[PDB]
Amino acid sequence: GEARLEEAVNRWVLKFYFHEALRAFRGSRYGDFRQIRDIMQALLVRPLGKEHTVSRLLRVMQCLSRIEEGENLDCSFDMEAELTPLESAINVLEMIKTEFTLTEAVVESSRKLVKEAAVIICIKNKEFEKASKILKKHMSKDPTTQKLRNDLLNIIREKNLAHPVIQNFSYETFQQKMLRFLESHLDDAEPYLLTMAKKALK
Template identity: 65%
Template sequence: MEALGGLPEEAVVNSHVLQFYFHQALAAYRAGRNRDFRQFRDVMQALLVRPLEKDHIMARRLRLMQFLSRVEEGENLDCTFDKESDLTPLESAIGVLELIHTEFAVTQETMETLREMVKEAAVIVCIRNREFEKAAEIVKRHIGKEPKSQVSLCWNERQLLEHCLVCPMGCWGTEVPGVVSGMSYRVGSMTPEGVRGFLEKHAH
């Protein structure tokens, strides 16, 4: 059975359902309802194997969901989105941001702000979980080549990053546990300002 425009009726219905759950997922994300966000994301994932209307708007929505899903899982270092690599969820989010930069009309300033936010969060999550070698690898891949003046980590966090580069296996002094426990990073606190502003402009 076909709907108006010659598309199969299922494709039209599925596309409307996908749009509905996309906006439900965004609302859950903004409100910090992590469980709801993941459930809506999973429903959307199931719909992707069914017939859908395919256009640039849907492509943008799906790309945003890829990014948000990785940020949402940011503190779960056992989670991986790249089967052929051991990238952490936030490192994977950096890769999605690069795709967004080429596909969306996003200003360079906005993209740099988001990119730096995610890079720093990726390192801090590893440090808080005492995955110092992973933290060192992320610093080398994503932050090591940049001027330190562009990195906005606080002094204690920067000092810990420097330790990671010199001694990634964890040869720390007695003061380090206090520094680690005192880090203020949390995925939920990282996202509202930078990511929410981005979503308000681009999630339609």
């Protein structure tokens, strides 16, 4: 009887902090995003009613969590093996790929940026063997990447961390592009507790 009413507010509390996380993520305020992430992670264990609306946002939160820590190779979300958080965002984007029922036309353009980021970040951290592994296992070998696909290995062979290709890559615009992509496939409905807090403090 009371289990649903707990599940009801649990969805509410979960969807409120998912909104504040994107809003903090959009403003490049990853400290509060990381704090809010831990709150949502603590809600994962709680009874959340099986609603497809929250499963979609949890996967979006999964991807953005791995991107925010994508420059920190001293941690791994898929801990069973050792996968850089950007390799982690690749598999999550592939789980977002199937469950969100997307045509690959809209997805593959974003999967370019993540696989590109997964290799470049490994280059800037001087783990050159790691970069080429992601480079062969995930990079497309299609024409659009063929210019950059050939560009990266040459740098990894030369250990040329000063190549413009590596230093023109800005991680901030990479995250923000991944945000509006993942966010465009969710609806901007205002969370119920945010509306209900607006009425009280007025």
